[PDB]
Amino acid sequence: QGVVGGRTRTGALANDTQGTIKGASLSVPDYYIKHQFDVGKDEIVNSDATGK
């Protein structure tokens, strides 16, 4: 937060620090939450044919 200084009515116009905006930066990660499965194509037709 910028700092407020003090001076008399006729006091010298000194300068004081300033509010600092800092650039924050995240990123959509380069790492996935994958879950993947090798469903055998035989267990697809088979399970469709005989599936309770």
Partner: protein, 51 residues
């Protein structure tokens, strides 16, 4: 004459025949083919009378 129309330019059509003189007879398969059955399930279920 022969020197004209040389071998390289004479692309002569051959009879559309392959001569695949291999396996004239598939006895066991041929007997069971035309009565094979393809089914959507991986196991073969049937009933065998035992007694």
């Amino acid at each position: 004459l022969t020197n004209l129309t040389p071998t390289e330019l004479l692309a002569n059509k051959a009879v559309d025949y392959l001569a695949n003189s291999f396996l004239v007879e598939t006895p066991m398969l041929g007997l069971l083919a035309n009565r094979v059955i393809n089914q959507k399930q991986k196991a073969i279920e049937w009933g065998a009378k035992v007694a």
